[model samples]
Target: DKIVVCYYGTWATYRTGLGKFDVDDIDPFLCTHLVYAFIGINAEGTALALDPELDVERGNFKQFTSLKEKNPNLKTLVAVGGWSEGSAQYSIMAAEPEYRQNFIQTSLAMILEYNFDGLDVDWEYPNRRDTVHGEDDIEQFSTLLKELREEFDNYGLLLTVAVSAVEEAAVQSYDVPSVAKYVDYIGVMTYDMHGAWDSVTGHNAPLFISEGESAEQESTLYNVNNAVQYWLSAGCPPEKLVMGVPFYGRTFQLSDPSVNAPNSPSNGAGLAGPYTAESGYVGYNEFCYILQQESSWTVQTDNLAKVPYAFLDYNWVSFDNVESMTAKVEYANSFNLRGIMLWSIETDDFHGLCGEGTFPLLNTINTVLAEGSTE
Candidate 1:
């Protein structure tokens, strides 16, 4: 129903007793969108997985309470069934009126208990969705959404889903038009266009086709556009979709080159990253810091797409920065989509290190959105 900004606290390590970061003189009015808790729930409302970082003070609900206390107007919704959580009973429960009533009763009870404004579904996929046990996900998604929407309708609780941006997902996932009406919004996961497992190496989220690219078929920019446009074309109101951007970068090794990159045709392939895949792809602070000192890698900006592609001597790592973030925000605005969101806000440029980082990236996004305009 509104612009949304969320952080998926899937990793357990970041559960910091739900203590809000001290944003020195931070203005809440600057963030008009909702800050969903991404509760990481299972098909049911009780089982919390991946993240248990909640402070026991509120019975592991402090994370939710703390987030809202800091930003009064922010929407706090609980996200359920993300990757690795192959849950679809929610779909079954939705199909039956009694079951749906049970689900909603439970859902609302929990929402009130946790002080949540609504619910967010991270189904990993729907309809032809291939996130394991999701082969028939498309229809299941609609059924679940339809029933869930109906069940929770009277109470004015909001509903939403985390959709994939990959072309295949765009085709088979949620029945956009049908579900759009029932749900409040669709958190269009526009990032993860390319990752280590991808056949070829590419950026996390590119705004437009990269420079010197003739066709979008081979570009990350095209993927995001396809996701946003696909939903719009499917009759999903643009205002109900929030595009996702990652605060992290996908990495590969220039060292192994042939050892792991045989699958990758582009010289950019080798090992996928965001973690060394070894020490794992370190955060931007560490990766960017390492790159600055190590003379092997060089940074190149793709103005045509507003993203930066990095060449690690012989390896390739296309990452998002303020420039590309600006482009994405502009594109979202042009479409009048809900808003933009990133993975874990803490991981972004919290320290504001390394030339252009997440802090600047977010600042640029908020600015273009006409937020923080008073400053």
Candidate 2:
């Protein structure tokens, strides 16, 4: 059976107005797996609530795991380490046997205490990037997973990992074969392939390399197809691979409004969304709302890339719509991959502000998967 894994960012509860999403906002039936994002690790190497006030003191963890009561088949998981949590702490923790065991035991205890069905390790990238251990992190990272798997087996809990989608990073950070052996699923974060960080504009998560991108080796490596193929070639089983889909888009301010195409020059990040309040990013709900309320915006699709983008004067955004998501789902089916994993459920158009039904993006995924099964 295919799985739809949705990550719930506990911090979303802090957003004001329509952007604020609580545990109660989740629809249990939408996703097969619900992952609570960012339970933290301190200097002691123990797993702890990153936001104790919201996640623990306020009962978010309990309220979150309780979604299972509505959907008996749903599996709830707790994720440790996101981009903000970084790799250094995890590197130190995984490097020492004592620290690793402490982490493993504490993680198991936390999940059990919260009534979660699994644990998702999301160390941005091990042994590379932010880590001090460099190549040493490669072996130790595997060791950590191996030990965690051993402990988790005693109680029959699932172990999964979220990994870098970039081929360069994946090779340096993970021992793919060894890691695949220990985890039930490997979530390749396929979004943020390009964003305001680059001097030029690009799709947030293109399905394929666009025209003229093949000339640059770097560009060819940044799409969903390339990332999935790289992981498959590296020995990850198709049944255990989960492709990450973003519920947000990357935004940019055009350097010259006259050149508003995919590879156009950009000044910097676009204006922040009212809800997400993050520059260079806009949630689907925010952008969709803008598209509906403003008449000046124009949307276009890049057939080669299999994604859509919108432009308004110097403001530009590259994001996935229903059609692009359908293409991504079909691509996943072609490979017989496990299923789709959303980076988060909160950013979806849950309020239906764009005239669609609530959670339209998520519903699109469910409907597409249902259709694929019938076929």
Candidate 3:
């Protein structure tokens, strides 16, 4: 059977009102593997709980892994290093053998203490961008995983890594074949292909490149198809690849209300969501609520990209719906890949605000994967 990996953001507990998501809100059956995001690394290279009060004091770790009581087959992992955790500490830790050993020992001890299934390393990028030692990061990253894989072999614990989906970043940061050899699953972050960072508006996770895109845009390789194909060609096994999908959308403020198309110019980020309170980003629950409550918004599908976008006045947002999610599931199945991975479950419509049922995006993925099997 194909696997579905879901990430649960620990910070989500701090959110107020309906947006607040705790361990109890997670549906055990929704995901085959549940990853807690995230555990941190101290200056001394020890694994530190980013939110001790919530994760340990409040028994969130125990309660989260205890989800296996309902689904005995469920696998739980604790992730280290998200975008916020940055690359400097990871770089230093991975560069030296002593620090690497310390990181592994402490990380393993914590995992065992909490009875987690394994570990997921989300080191944004190894050699690119924010690393301290940019040139040696590629080899150092591979070395770290290799060592961790050896240690984990004794207990048969899983070792999965989240890597960039963009070709420019992927080639610079990873030694793909080496990475494939060490990790149990390689989680490619296939979303965020485009966002408010660009001057023009585009889909957050387009399934394919739109034909209307210019030659320069086509060369950028900003689509799910190109990202997945690159990983496969780089020697990653299809079965070991877990494609990540976004539970939220990237928003933009249209420069001209009349010019609301895929490549239209954007002034900057759109207004922040009431719940997320982050400009240029809106969770499915937040945006879907707007779509349902406000008739002024207009929704349209990009036939080429196979995703949807909505606009209202000067605001524009590109996001995934049941249709787009289903299409991505089928796309993964076509290549015999492992399964889809949600960025985080908290941002999804867990409360069923849109009347589509709680965890609608997740349910769509589960249903699509189930239908593909004969049993």
Candidate 4:
């Protein structure tokens, strides 16, 4: 049960202008299997932003192409959907066979167009609680997967989808039992169960229950147990499931008394006004660079869950680090998921990649694999 660690590659991360990746950063020899990049492009023509792979880097295409050139065993897959826009289209496409067929055609075509090997559908949700595609999304989603499986099988290509860490993911995304019939693996996005989004402050990917008295009262839902249980109960076999891990953290200021220390707004943690190091909210790359430089933020680790946190003068930010990430990889083995996925490889500290993993993405994964945590 050595879980695969799929790192998403991006234009910004791979660009020489940003930080160049040495083969050592990848260390392909460390992984059981590989998911090298997430190919999101707002290329739906006029509906550009609505498209997938927002950070489209043709150079990454070449980078990965070169990656295989050096190491042939690395198996890369392209994630088509992400945490935003196009997911709404999944159920709509699923409901109508003609539309579903068209979507499948277009999606697979995009993979071939990009010269990639497989597809990972990152649908925000099917029957979503945050925002479902529609009531019919579940059945439609299942059917759409069935169609993809049929098509991919014909092409000898593989197809997979990203599931929410929550239980609703299994219910809303697709029928696990039904889906298992058609695809190779299910990438379970088990991270982001809790974030600054909640009014109450907590870790981004806590493995167990929190000690705070405030967290228990809130309705927030992002945890390892429930997410693991939901998918298993929903009929997804542990073998084909891949747990998603985050390489970043979310920071929220303890603004307003209604959401202060012990009495934070139940699940809704107070947030700072929108100002990312980049244009908008910071994703992993900007997050690492921004927080690492913040004088107020002090990094710490939670040995209990094997995750990390940074407590500021007036705020609490939470995410994963190598020590805690080891626990997650262990969890992946305990659960027997096929692999682990970080949001992207580009954002990690190059210095972190070595010397016992300051940010050793591939090294930590390979270390976990060799240690025999999984079956």
TM-score, each model?
0.78, 0.97, 0.97, 0.78
lDDT string for model 1 (1-375, tens) is 335375634342332432223322223343444443444433443434334434333254545445557778766666666666644554444344565456556666767777767777776655432333454556656776787787677777888777777556666666668778788777778876666555565566766665545563553344587678877888877788788887667665444444322124353334232323322233444456557777866777766556776765456676776667777777787777778776645445555557764366566767777742211
Tens-digit lDDT track for model 2 on 124-215? 87876579787899999899999999999999999999999978778889989999999999998989989999998899999888643655
Cα lDDT of candidate 2 equals: 0.89
- Rank by lDDT (best first): 3, 2, 1, 4
**C-alpha lDDT of all candidate models, in order:** 0.59, 0.89, 0.90, 0.59
Off by over 4 Å in 2: 215-219, 373-375
Q: How does residue 127 of candidate 4 score in lDDT?
A: 66
Candidate 1 to truth, TM: 0.78
Off by over 4 Å in 4: 1-3, 9-27, 30-63, 129-133, 213-221, 256-306, 353-359
Q: What lDDT does candidate 4 reach at residue 244?
A: 75
Best model number under lDDT: 3
Residue clash pairs of candidate 3: none
